[PDB]
Amino acid sequence: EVQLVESGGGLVQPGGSLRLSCAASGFNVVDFSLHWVRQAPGKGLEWVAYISSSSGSTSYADSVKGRFTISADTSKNTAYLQMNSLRAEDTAVYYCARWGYWPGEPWWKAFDYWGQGTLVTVSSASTKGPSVFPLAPSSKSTSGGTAALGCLVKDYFPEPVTVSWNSGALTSGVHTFPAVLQSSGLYSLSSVVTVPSSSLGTQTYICNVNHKPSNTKVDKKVEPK
Amino acid sequence: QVQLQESGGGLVQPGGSLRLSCAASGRTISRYAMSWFRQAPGKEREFVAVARRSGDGAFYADSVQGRFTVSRDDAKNTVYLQMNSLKPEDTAVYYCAIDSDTFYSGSYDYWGQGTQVTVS
Amino acid sequence: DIQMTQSPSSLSASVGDRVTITCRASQSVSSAVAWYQQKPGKAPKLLIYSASSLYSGVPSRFSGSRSGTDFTLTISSLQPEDFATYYCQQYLYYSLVTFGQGTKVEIKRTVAAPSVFIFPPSDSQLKSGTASVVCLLNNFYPREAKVQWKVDNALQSGNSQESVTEQDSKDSTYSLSSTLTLSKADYEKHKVYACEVTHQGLSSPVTKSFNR
Amino acid sequence: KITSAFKYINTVISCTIFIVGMVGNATLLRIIYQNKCMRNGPNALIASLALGDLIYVVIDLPINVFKLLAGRWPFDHNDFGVFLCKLFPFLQKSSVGITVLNLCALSVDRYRAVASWSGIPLVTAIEIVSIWILSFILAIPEAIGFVMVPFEYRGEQHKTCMLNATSKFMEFYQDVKDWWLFGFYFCMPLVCTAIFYTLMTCEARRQLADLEDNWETLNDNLKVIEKADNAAQVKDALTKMRAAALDAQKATPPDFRHGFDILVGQIDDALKLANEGKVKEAQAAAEQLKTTRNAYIQKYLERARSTLKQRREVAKTVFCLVVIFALCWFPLHLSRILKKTVYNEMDKNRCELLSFLLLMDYIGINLATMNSCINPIALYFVSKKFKNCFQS
Ligand SMILES: COC(c1ccccc1)(c1ccccc1)[C@H](Oc1nc(C)cc(C)n1)C(=O)O
Secondary structure, three states, X not given: OOEEEEEOOOOEOXXXXXXXEEEEEOOOHXXXXXXXXXXXXOXXXXXXXXXXXXXXXXXXXXXXXXXXXXEEEOOOOEEEEEEEOOOOOOOEEEEEEEEOOOOOHHHOOXXXXXXXXEEEOEOOOOOOOOEEEEOOOOOOOOOOOOOOEEEEEEOOOOOOOEEEEHHHOEOOOEEEOOOEOOOOOOOEEEEEEOOOOOOOOOOOOEEEEEEOOOOEEEEXXXXXX | OOOOOOEOOOOOOOOOEOOXXXXXXOOOHHHOOEEEEEEOOOOOXXXXXXXXXXXXXXXXXXXXXXXXXXXXXXXXXXXXXOOEOOOHHHOEEEEEEEOOXXXXXXXXXXXXXXXXXXXX | OOOEEEOOOEEEOOOOOOEEEEEEEOOOOOOOEEEEEEOOOOOOEEEEOOOOOEOOOOOOOEEEEEEOOEEEXXXXXXXXXXXXXXXXXEOOOOOOOEEOOOEEEEOOOOOEOOOOOOEOOOHHXXXXXXXEEEEEEEOOEOOOXXXXXXXXXXXXXXXXXXXXXXXXXXXXXXXXXXXXXXXXXXXXXXXXXEEEEEEOOOOOOXXXXXXO | OOOOHHHHHHHHHHHHHHHHHHHHHHHHHHHHHHOOOOOOHHHHHHHHHHHHHHHHHHHHHHHHHHHHOOOOOOOOOOOOHHHHHHHHHHHHHHHHHXXXXXXXXXXXXXXXXXXXOOOOOHHHHHHHHHHHHHHHHHHHHHHHOOEEEEEOHHHOOXXXXXXXXXXXXXXXXXXXXXXXXXXXXXXXXXXXXXXXXXXXXXXXHHHHHHHHHHHHHHHHHHHHHXXXXXXXXXXXXXXXXXXXXXXXXXXXXXXHHHHHHHHHHHHHHHHHHHHOOOHHHHHHHHHOOHHHHHHXXXXXXXXXXXXXXXXXHHHHHHHHHHHHHHHHHHHHHHHHHOOOOOOXXXXXXXXXXXXXXXXXXXXXXXXXXXXXXXHHHHHHHHOOOHHHXXXX
C-alpha cells in the first residue's frame, strides 16, 4: 500500500538549520501532491507548507514563511523540507501527508495516508546529570494510612526519561508525572507511591532515575519523616 | 444572594418516590452548575448529585447511582431531583447549591438553607 | 481565514452510548469537510470525507451529516475503541486549509474527593540552597480542581507549576501534584506552608500544613 | 313536496349523463393508447380513472332511469333479477373508491417526482391493479346487505329492494355508516392531498431558490474580480466562485458535469496565478471564463428551469380534479349530515326548512352523478396537452 516515511530530525540550537526527508513508496510522487502539517506538544494541528511534484507549485503558511523551503525529487521519490533560523517555540512533531489531483474522486478523499511524525526540539542548555531529592511524607500526615512517598527530580536533559520506584521493585499503585517545563532549560518530574503500610522493610524506597545521553543513573534514599 | 428555597418531598414510605426542587431568581442557572449536598446527622454536607450546563452531562455520586436523577430548566432557573426506591438510610436534610465559577473548578461559596427529607 | 469551531471540548461517555460532535464554519464551504481520529503518540487517520461518506476500513457506526454551514459527527454505539481525539478539517483548496481545536472523549464514573497526602521537602534541598514545597491530590474525578498556594498563612504567586496525569486503567481516575521550588534566602524566612484545595466533590475547602 | 317534474328532470339529466360520458370516456381511452407519446405513469392513472366510469354508467344509468319512470324495479321475479339490486350499489361504491384512490396516488407521485428533479412502469401497473382490487374489497359490504321485501301496491305481492339488514354486522353497519362514508370518501382525499401539495410548493421554491443564488454569486464575483485592485480581492472572490461551482455541480444531473469540472479547473488556475502575485495573469485567467460560462452553464440553467415549468403544468392539471370532485360531492354530504344531528325531529321550521333540505338532497344526487362525465371536459379545458389530441 501507499507508504510515506519521515526522517531527519534532531535537537538544534536556536537560529540553526535542519533538513528533513519524506520518502514515498508504493506510488509515484508525480501523481499525488505532498504537504507538511505541524503539531505543537499538547496543541492543535496546523498547516505549514505544500509542494506539487508535477506542476512544481509550492505554498507556505504565514507561520513558516521566509524560513522554510520545500522541494522534492521525483527520481529519488523523496520530498525535503529545510528549516532555517529555528526558534524555541517552533519545537513540534511534523508529519508529511499526501493529496490527490483535482479531476475525479482522488481529490475528494483529502489526506488518506500520513507519515509517522518527526520530533524537532530547539534548546540551548547542555546535557547534565539529574539531581534527586527525597520527598517523604511527614510523620503526622497520614499516620498509619497511605503515605505519599516521593522522589523529586530536577536539572536534567534526556528525552526518554525512565524513573523507577524502589529501583523498579515498587510498581503497585505508583503515579509518575510528565516532565514540567521548569525554568532555565531542563525539566522536572516526580513519582509517588501510595504504599499504605509504613513497615521498615519497605521503608527503603531507593528511587532510581536514568539519563541515557549523559550515562547518569541517580538513586535517592528517602528518609521516613 | 442567590435564594434557592427548595420545596418538595419531606416524607415517604419505603420503596416510594419523591421529587425535590430548588429554583433561583436574579441569578440564572443557564451559565452555572447546580449541586446537591446531603447533610447527614453529625456529618458535613456530602455530595450527592451535580448538573452541568445545558448539554454537558450530569455526574452523580455512588450513593444515588441510578436511584436519583437531576434535570434543570433554564427558562425559570429550576432544578429537580427524582429519588426512587428509597432505603431508610436516606433520612437527612438536603441542600441545593450553585457554583461561583464558569469552569466548574471548586467554587461553593453559597450554601442551601436545608430541607429535611426523611424516609421510613 | 475560514475558521472552524468545534462545540464540545471534552465529552464523558460510557460504553454503549451515542455521541455527537458539531463543527461550524465561517464561510460557505461545500461538503469539503473531513474528520480524523488520533490516539496519543500516533498520526491521525481518516474517518469521513465529503461530509457524508464512509472510508474503507471504518465501522458503520460512524456517521456524518451536513446541514448548511454546520456539520455533525455521530457515533451510535460507543465501543471501547472510540476513546481518542477527533479532529475536523476543511479543504476547499490546497493553500487555504485550517483545522479545529479538537475534542477529547473519556469515560464517565462517580465522584471521588481528592485525598490530600501532603509531604514536606527534604533537608538536602535546603542544604543545597533550594527547597521545594510540594503538595499532592490523589485519585479524583472529574478533572477540574483548584489549588491556591499559601506560605506563612499568606497567599503567594509565582513558582506554581503543576501537572496532571492521564486516566489510569485501574479505576479511571486522575492525580495532580503542585511544586513550589524556592531559594534558601526566602525559605529560611518562610515558616508555615499550607496548600488550600477545592474540588467540586468536596463541600468545604480543606488545607493541611506543616511547619519548618 | 316535490313534483313529478323532478322525476322528468332526473330522467333528462340521466340521459344527458349517459350520452355525454359514454362518448367522452370512449375518446379518452382511445387517445390514451392511440398515441405513442401520451403513454406514462400519470396518463396511465388517468386512463384507469376514466375507464372506471364506463362500466358504471352504461349499466347503472339505464336501470336507474327505467326504475325512476316505471311501475317498479325491472324483472321483479327472477333469479338474476334480484342480482340487479345487489349489483346496483356495488358498482357505484367501487367507482367512487377507485376515483378517490387514483387522485391520492396522483398526489403522491406528483410530490415524489418534484423531489427527484431530473411507458407504464411496473410500479404504476402494480398500484393500479392494487387500487382496483381494494375498491371492490371495500365495497362488497353494500353488495352483501341488499335484499328485496314484499309490498302490496294494487293488491299485488310485489318486490322492492331496500336495506333490510339480516346479520348482526349488517345492523351494526346500518347503525353507523354515514360518518364512515363522510370520513373515508370526503376527508382523507381532502387531507393527504393538501399536505402533499404544501410539501411540493415548499420544496420547489427551495430547489430553485438556491440555483438562482449560485448563479448570482458567480456573476457578482466575476464583477468583483474584473475590478480587483490587489491579489487579496482576487483570492477572496475566487474562493466564493469555487464554493459556488462545487455546490452547483452536485445539483446538475448526469456533458454538463465536464463543463463544471473545466470551470473548477480554470478557477484553480486563476487562483494559482494570483498566489504568486501576478495580478494581471489572474485577471486574464478570470476573463477567460467567458468561453466556458456561455457554452455549458447557460444551456444547463435554461433546460433545468424550463424543465421545472413542465413539471408544474402537470401538477396543476392533476390538482384541478381534486377541487372539482370536492365541489361536486360536498352538497350531498351537506344535506346528509344536517339531517342527522340537527335533524327536523319536531322543529317548527318544517314548513320551510324541510322542503329546502329535500330539494338540496334531491339535486345533490344529480350533482354527484355529474362527476362521472365531467373529467373529459376539465382535462380538455385545462391540460392543454390532451387538448391537442382531442383537436386532432
Ligand atoms: C343516495 O343513494 C346513493 C346510492 C348508492 C348506491 C346504491 C343506491 C343509492 C346515491 C345514488 C346515486 C347518486 C348518489 C348517491 C348513496 O351513495 C352514496 N355514495 C357515496 C360515496 C356517499 C354517499 C353519502 N352516498 C347512498 O349510499 O345512499
